[PDB]
Design a protein around this ligand. Structure first.
Ligand SMILES: Nc1ncnc2c1ncn2[C@@H]1O[C@H](COP(=O)(O)OP(=O)(O)OP(=O)(O)O)[C@@H](O)[C@H]1O
Ligand SMILES: Nc1ncnc2c1ncn2[C@@H]1O[C@H](COP(=O)(O)OP(=O)(O)OP(=O)(O)O)[C@@H](O)[C@H]1O
Ligand SMILES: [Mg+2]
Ligand SMILES: [Mg+2]
Lengths: 17, 715, 715, 17
């Protein structure tokens, strides 16, 4: 795709709100 | 294709709002609360993993990929979700729609569609890209019921009141028309001829009509007030009764103010439900008849009035949106100063200790100046609107009189009818003005109805639960936790696979680290939550096999954080169940070591516990909790932090009381300190969400395992 | 003789209000906040012994005597203070004035002077009477400053703005009079004689006047907005700056909402400071000139209008008070409903556990029904007032027009002047209506100023301390507490006769039971309060000799609860002191065993701690508190609850590093758990509000006393 | 006076607010 996919553990690091 | 964005209902709805915006752009329209449950949104925020999982289970094919200035290559799909930071304050979610000429359209749930340039946007968002593609299972359709009619249906059993109000308003307008025409009859016949007797008769006969008008206004006011109060009360009853039946995850996911604000939202909904409908229904016909009468009077003056109301409507429409924008900005900037004041007052001790007075008084001043600046912007908008409206109204009033005088100079109408036209101008302009000004109320009310009625489509606990009252009698026997895996949301599993056996009539001591899950296991024991895999077996029958009411009635749990309700202590000890004698309360106090201090109170048992019982000491609150727990004679007694406070003998009394049951009821004690749990038949020591040692004290001491090591730690 | 009562500003201010009412009856007039200081008012309430002590100090001879329905026998002096209970809800204080014919006059701070009967009163209050007698040491006098003659002084440096506003309003009225008189020339000359060119000239010549009027209105509105915003900002800043310097007893006595409400009180004060004075100043002159013009036109119509406005004022005055009573009832019944909702939402877990859903739904319904009843009563009052005002206005409009027509027929004035009088009626009535409506605003604003300006007359921390820090530039040496007796208010003293010797550069451990006073002693070190008896000697000098700045700067105290301010972590570590380097911060982070987890944050030191750092764990909160404390490198370091959260290695590292200080700093460790304080140089055991054991571990164990008795556990 | 003097201990019990 656009780039290399990130891992789930680092994916959890993304937060909203 | 049209770009669609969904405004967030509350603060922490960024992910759900972005997902809804994507769905409504690709076609699907789902309810926002259901999506929030799908995304696993919590108070702190929404993890991107939860958003991706919700997208995948919804039907989208979604991926969370990193990006570093790679938004120029054609290798991408739009729209796409991004994460930003507000000048390094707090994280937020936006969605990019299209980028071209280094200028980008992004929907932010906070504001709406907002322009950005490449440099500033790149300096705003750090990294992260959620890409969404419609899958084969993606089915377009609409899943939201129109809730406006759902809330307006309360008017069905109240048709008499609104019919009476409509009739009274019609009679009000009919009587007011004569009062308007009075001045014309004055200046056309009662002046040009000196007929004093007719003057006395007519002036007295056109004054009682005003009294009838006042009586009609009184009746209308009473009816409208009663209708509004009834609708507000009914809506509040429905909302509260539905909220008290919602599951525990709804309460855990949201805050308190979010639930509370929907009570005030009931009045906003009622404003459309009660006021708007009657207002438009009467004002449309009254404006039509007023305009017809004005056309009968004159044509050019009616055209001038139509032009004036046209400019008024145009001005209101063009100035409406900045008013809401400024109001939202003020509400955002004055909610930051009030937080600083409370924070500064609460931590005044540390502020004084470190001497940070100058810093605090300098910091608060900047926030106050920002609030004043926002208020001044709103004042600027209001002053501009008022000045333009006043100019239009004054010019229309001057132009009407000039045109009437000019027509009289030619003589296209009588001189006295100009005054009657001026009088009827109010009756013609008021309803159309109300109709023009009703639009922001309708918008706010429909948003409010979408926000509040969103909750009412959720599923309560009774529906989810199946039936098991046909065979069950009580909750006695042996307790099995088999392969029980539970997630506290969409995060890492706090509880792992367990084979736990709690035998008949045995004292169980569950001990573990502070960060380990102990209270959560008790929560699943009473079935506040549902495990994703595994089962809870009682007498060879699963959780799906035990009736809810039986679980609630036969299990008593003393919370870590005891909550004391406002009211009498008697109501506190025996709540939920009635028709209990005082003897049970007396013995509950006796084995709870509560009879000693309760007698010291001014009232024996009618003492009123104000401020949620904050006057009483923590140990007294614990004693009250214990008395309430054993007042219900439950089958399963799960203590959590009863021994937190003790007088070196009170724990001995409570241990003697627990030993004094003479029944096979099972008591499970969650233990932090190990000296309290001695001579215990069964102890379960947990590390990393797993019970390792299962046995009595002696053999596990001899085992030379982590249990004795923890002892080498506590000692 | 006149009977006077004092309305309480806050909920828990009954005793001080009753004492002030007694004083203002005997002659003395003291400030309410100062009386609160003498009476020892706390959050829970005021004790009767507190009132007796305050009266004795003030000069009264006071006695608290019991009573059992003995209010008939003579030889007891009225007025007297009594304690009542409101239908078994809460205690409150009233003052009884006169007894006669079994009917009683009592002043209640909540409402005012309220009638009572013998049976009802005797069934309301249980027992207890405070009798007050003016002694020889009582001198009548007035000590209360006029609050307004202080807040209006803020208008002194802004004379230009108010002068411009006054001139703009005068020009506005002058231009409006011409627009009013326009209709007279319109209907007297331009219609009777067909002067079309003159009509065109006059119509254009009376249109620019309205444009100038609109421009003047814009300018005056801008100036008023700017003036009001400036006054609000100044008042709020001054109030906050004075509050931030008040002593700790003021903060401990009151809650947070009490402090916060005075911020919104500034707007109420400004509405009189800015709006009321200019409003009355302009309406007086415009009403005067309008009345003179109307009298020039006609006398009978002017007198009828005067009667109309007199009737309107009479109705407003007679209906003023019930509106306030209904508003107070709604406010007090609406602050009880929100309490039930909040506790129900917070304690939803207990409600689900005990299944008390129907009870909560039934209970909330009654409160909401009471709220609706109060709202309906206020609405009915509003409807009555509006109906009477509308009747008066309509009847006045009818009679004025009829009398004008009668005068025109008889020939007392021209026909066109009647419309001129009708137009000028607005300019005559609106200013007088505003003047009439201004009175309740002035009353509530003077009450608000007395509420807010009362605090500003208090004495801050700096004034009481002796201004002499010469002899000592650093806080080193020997610490000695000599017979230090501290009372936390008007209760039993928590600290008794003590003799403490903290040696030169010695790490000492204060141990005691939870109910014993340990943190209070540390606060006495920090000089948050002032000892009543005894003294604190530091290297041969007392606290009152040494300056407050050195005490605040060179002494660090770790609070029981770790309060983390919202903002960047860097500012939190170094607040109060600036120009601070980074590497000592790094070594402090290593010192607190906190440098490890900072890298795990998304940003190293620029991360913003939202919600006062609620996301961070309690152990991390303690680590940050320790880092903040030791960044200041104090001479006296007070650890209180550092060891609360443990990983079995963190306290080992903290102890090893504390042993690695190589300096003569004095460290005081407050200990709850006994095993935490091992091989300590000095241990002070505190019980019965006094130090009992003073020695090292070995000799205290060999002593076979209370310390070894406490070591019966933890083995 | 009117009655016997009251002790301070129960005077502590007498509370307002
Ligand atoms: N909002 C939350 N409330 C409670 N526990 C949470 C929450 N979010 C995550 N958790 C995790 O769920 C588990 C609950 O722990 P449990 O309440 O059983 O322990 P405890 O001994 O009572 O201690 P503590 O309350 O101090 O965590 C812990 O692993 C905790 O980290
Ligand atoms: N409003 C109050 N705030 C704090 N202490 C109060 C208050 N009213 C009375 N006290 C008394 O002041 C003393 C305070 O000692 P303190 O409780 O602070 O020691 P401590 O070790 O902090 O105990 P704890 O940790 O349990 O609070 C106690 O006697 C307490 O009962
Ligand atoms: Mg816990
Ligand atoms: Mg403490």
């Amino acid at each position: 795709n656009i780039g290399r996919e990130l891992t789930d553990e680092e994916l959890m690091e993304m937060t909203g709100g | 294709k049209k770009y669609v964005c969904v405004r967030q209902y509350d603060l922490t709805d960024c992910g759900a709002a972005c997902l809804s915006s994507i769905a409504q752009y690709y076609g699907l329209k789902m309810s926002l609360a259901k999506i929030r449950e799908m995304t696993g949104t919590d108070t702190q925020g929404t993890n991107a993993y939860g958003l991706i999982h919700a997208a995948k289970q919804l039907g989208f094919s979604a991926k969370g990929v990193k990006a570093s200035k790679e938004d120029l290559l054609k290798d991408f799909r739009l729209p796409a979700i991004a994460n930003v930071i507000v000048d390094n304050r707090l994280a937020h979610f936006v969605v990019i729609y299209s980028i071209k000429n280094r200028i980008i359209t992004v929907a932010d749930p906070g504001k709406g569609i907002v322009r950005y340039s490449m440099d500033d946007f790149c300096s705003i968002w750090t990294g992260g890209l959620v890409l969404l593609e419609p899958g084969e299972a993606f089915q377009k359709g609409d899943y939201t019921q129109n809730m406006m009619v759902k809330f307006a249906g309360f008017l069905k059993p109240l048709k008499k009141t609104v019919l009476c109000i409509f009739l009274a308003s019609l009679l009000y307008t009919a009587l007011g028309i004569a009062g308007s025409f009075y001045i014309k009859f004055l200046f056309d016949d009662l002046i040009k001829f000196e007929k004093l007797n007719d003057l006395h008769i007519i002036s007295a006969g056109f004054a009682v009509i005003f009294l009838l008008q006042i009586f009609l206004n009184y009746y209308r006011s009473i009816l409208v007030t009663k209708l509004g109060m009834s609708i507000d009360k009914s809506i509040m009853m429905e909302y509260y009764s539905h909220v008290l039946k919602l599951p525990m995850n709804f309460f855990n996911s949201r805050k308190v103010g979010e639930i509370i604000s929907r009570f005030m939202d009931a009045s906003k909904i009622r404003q459309a439900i009660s006021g708007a409908t009657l207002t438009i229904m009467i004002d449309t016909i009254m404006a039509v008849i007023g305009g017809i009468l004005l056309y009968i009077q004159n044509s050019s003056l009616f055209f001038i009035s139509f032009i004036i109301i046209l400019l008024y409507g145009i001005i209101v429409t063009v100035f409406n949106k900045p008013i809401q924008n400024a109001n939202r900005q003020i509400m955002e900037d004055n909610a930051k100063l009030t937080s600083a004041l409370v924070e500064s007052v609460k931590g005044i001790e540390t502020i004084k200790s470190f001497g940070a007075e100058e810093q605090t008084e300098k910091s608060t001043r900047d926030k106050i100046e920002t609030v004043m600046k926002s208020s001044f912007k709103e004042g600027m908008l209001y002053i501009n609107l008022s000045s333009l409206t006043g100019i239009v109204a004054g010019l229309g009033g001057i132009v009407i009189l000039w045109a009437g005088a000019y027509n009289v100079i030619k003589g296209n109408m009588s001189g006295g009818q100009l005054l009657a036209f001026n009088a009827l101008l109010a009756y013609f302009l008021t309803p159309v003005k109300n109709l023009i000004d009703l639009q922001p109320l309708i918008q706010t009310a429909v948003v409010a109805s979408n926000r509040l009625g969103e909750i009412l489509e959720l599923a309560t606990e009774k529906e989810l639960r199946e039936d098991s009252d046909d065979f069950v009698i009580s909750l006695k026997g042996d307790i099995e936790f088999r392969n029980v895996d539970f997630r506290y949301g969409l995060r890492k599993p706090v509880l792992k696979n367990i084979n736990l056996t709690i035998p008949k009539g045995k004292t169980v001591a569950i001990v573990g680290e502070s960060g380990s899950g102990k209270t959560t296991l008790a929560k699943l024991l009473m079935n506040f939550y549902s495990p994703e895999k595994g089962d809870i077996l009682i007498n060879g029958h699963s959780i799906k096999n035990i009736s809810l009411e039986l679980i609630r009635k036969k299990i008593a749990f003393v919370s870590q954080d005891v909550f004391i309700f406002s009211g009498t202590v008697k109501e506190n000890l025996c709540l939920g169940n009635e028709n209990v004698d005082m003897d049970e309360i007396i013995k509950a106090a006796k084995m709870a070591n509560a009879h000693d201090f309760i007698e010291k109170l001014p009232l024996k048992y009618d003492t009123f516990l104000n401020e949620s019982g904050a006057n009483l000491s923590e140990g007294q609150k614990q004693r009250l909790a214990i008395a309430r727990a054993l007042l219900k004679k439950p089958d399963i007694l799960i203590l959590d932090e009863a021994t937190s406070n003790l007088d070196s003998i009170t724990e001995n009394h409570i241990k003697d009381a627990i030993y004094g049951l003479e029944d096979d009821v099972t008591v499970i004690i969650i233990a932090h300190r190990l000296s309290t749990i001695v001579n215990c038949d069964k102890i379960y020591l947990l590390k990393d969400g797993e019970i390792v040692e299962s046995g009595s004290h002696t053999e596990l001491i001899a085992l030379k395992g982590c249990y004795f090591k923890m002892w080498k730690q506590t000692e």
